[PDB]
């Protein structure tokens, strides 16, 4: 629609699509190297 | 309300006014050829409303002189009135004549002694039209030179990378450009009562040697059809003379190609109407001009209508937005830069062949008189417009 009409800088900037929160993690050692 | 002025216009003043409007449009928009609309409205903060005297291009226009586009238009009109119809060899000879006189040439400097002499005309011609109508003089054939051109003007070769054709330099000047659609108002007016398929045969004959492509022919066809439509009409029928009428009439019968129909539909359902402009400095910075420029940028690429479809769609926007105000429409068309001579000259041709004669301001007539064309050229135009009102052999 016109989601860009309701873009607010105070309350937070976010696109339409829901939070691509993909992540994975090894330990700090296997991450550094 | 709309343009009233006189009553219902006749059928001779219509034609002479179409040629006169084409003249004033080309002469007024000549110096602003090849620049964007923000640049034009920043150089002319008080509006593009008078003949410019000071031009500093590579081939400078002089005060009160038209370009090659109107030369071709009027030569088509005259030669047509001579052979009483669209006969290819006749008007092609007339065109090479208009391209020949007054000109000059330059020689070369090549190691082995290679000689590709450059002929410089006395006016401004598109490089593709220059090339094709000097290949005609180069001795070669008149019918299959487009096939040499489509593959000659292919300096684009690979154009490896390099994204937008922003530079008019990388835009496609060739068999599908605006050259054909620019000279199809007088043709479409000579055939206002002849039938659509006969009209199409005529406009196809006038194109065979330069614009064989289908989309260029479609552009020529829609502009000629608009010319004929407004020719048959009268400026007083507050129901017959409406932009929606002309646009739907175009959409149904004539518009056959895909993208042309898309642009026409887009122009149709987003069309709006400007109110009367008296202060141009305030109009050039308002919501209305901005909305119009937004639609114009939709209808083209970065404000440059090189392909015939973009050209014809832009031509209808400038004219249908000032319904009832022809001079305002030709000013708005010249204010958009790009191919301003061609766009504004076609808008003026149509405004003339619809409204007639009583709308050309006195200052533009006087400017045509005081230029280099002078009384000779001015009344040559009015006379070629008079010797067009009734010619129908074959």
């Amino acid at each position: 629609s016109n989601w860009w009409a309701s873009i607010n800088r105070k309350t937070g900037i976010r696109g339409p699509d829901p939070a691509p929160a993909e992540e994975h993690t090894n330990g700090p050692a296997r991450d550094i190297i | 309300p709309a343009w009233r002025g006189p009553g219902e216009v006749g059928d001779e003043d219509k034609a002479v006014g179409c040629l006169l409007g084409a003249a004033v449009g080309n002469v007024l928009a000549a110096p602003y050829q090849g620049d964007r609309h923000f640049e034009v409205i920043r150089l002319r903060r008080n509006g593009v409303t008078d003949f410019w005297k000071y031009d500093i291009g590579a081939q400078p226009v002089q005060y009160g002189q038209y370009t090659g586009d109107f030369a071709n238009l009027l030569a088509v009109a005259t030669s047509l009135s001579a052979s009483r119809g669209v006969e290819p060899a006749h008007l092609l000879g007339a065109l090479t004549r208009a391209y020949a006189e007054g000109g000059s040439s330059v020689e070369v400097e090549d190691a082995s002694g290679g000689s590709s002499s450059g002929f410089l005309p006395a006016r401004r011609y598109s490089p593709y039209d220059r090339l094709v109508m000097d290949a005609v003089l180069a001795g070669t054939d008149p019918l299959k030179v487009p096939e040499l051109a489509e593959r000659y003007l292919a300096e684009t070769t690979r154009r490896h990378a390099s994204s937008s054709s922003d530079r008019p330099d990388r835009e496609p000047h060739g068999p599908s450009d605006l050259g054909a659609a620019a000279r199809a108002a007088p043709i479409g007016l000579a055939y206002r009562r002849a039938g659509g398929e006969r009209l199409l045969a005529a406009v196809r004959r006038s194109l065979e040697f330069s614009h064989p492509t289908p989309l260029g022919l479609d552009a020529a066809h829609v502009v000629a059809a608009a010319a004929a439509w407004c020719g048959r009409q009268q400026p007083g029928d507050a129901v017959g003379a409406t932009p929606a009428a002309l646009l739907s009439h175009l959409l149904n019968d004539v518009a056959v190609t895909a993208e042309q129909c898309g642009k026409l539909r887009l122009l149709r359902d987003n069309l709006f109407q400007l109110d009367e402009v008296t202060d141009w400095r305030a109009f050039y910075a308002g919501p209305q001009w901005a909305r119009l420029t937004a639609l114009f940028s939709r209808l083209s690429f970065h404000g440059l209508a090189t392909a015939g479809s973009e050209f014809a769609s832009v031509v209808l926007l400038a004219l249908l937005s000032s319904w009832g105000r022809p001079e305002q429409a030709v000013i708005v068309a010249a204010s958009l830069g790009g191919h301003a001579p061609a766009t504004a000259q076609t808008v003026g041709a149509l405004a003339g062949t619809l409204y007639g004669q009583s709308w050309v301001p006195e200052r533009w007539w006087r400017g045509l008189g005081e230029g280099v064309e002078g009384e000779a050229g001015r009344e040559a135009v009015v006379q070629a417009g008079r010797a067009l009102a009734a010619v129908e052999l074959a």
Partner: protein, 55 residues
């Protein structure tokens, strides 16, 4: 000083365009030719709407 200069230049627009057009052709001018060109285009005797807006 800026206001004074900008008030000088936004009266002689015709003379400035005549000068630019002349200089674009020959790429060179002498002060006497420049002076006569500017003389050919004296400033406006009165101010209309456009002149007032520019000023």
């Amino acid at each position: 000083c800026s206001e004074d200069v900008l008030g000088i230049l936004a009266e002689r627009q015709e003379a400035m365009w005549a000068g630019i057009k002349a200089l674009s052709d020959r790429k060179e001018l002498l002060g006497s030719e420049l002076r006569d060109i500017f003389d050919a285009h004296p400033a406006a005797t009165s101010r209309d709407r456009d002149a007032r807006a520019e000023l």
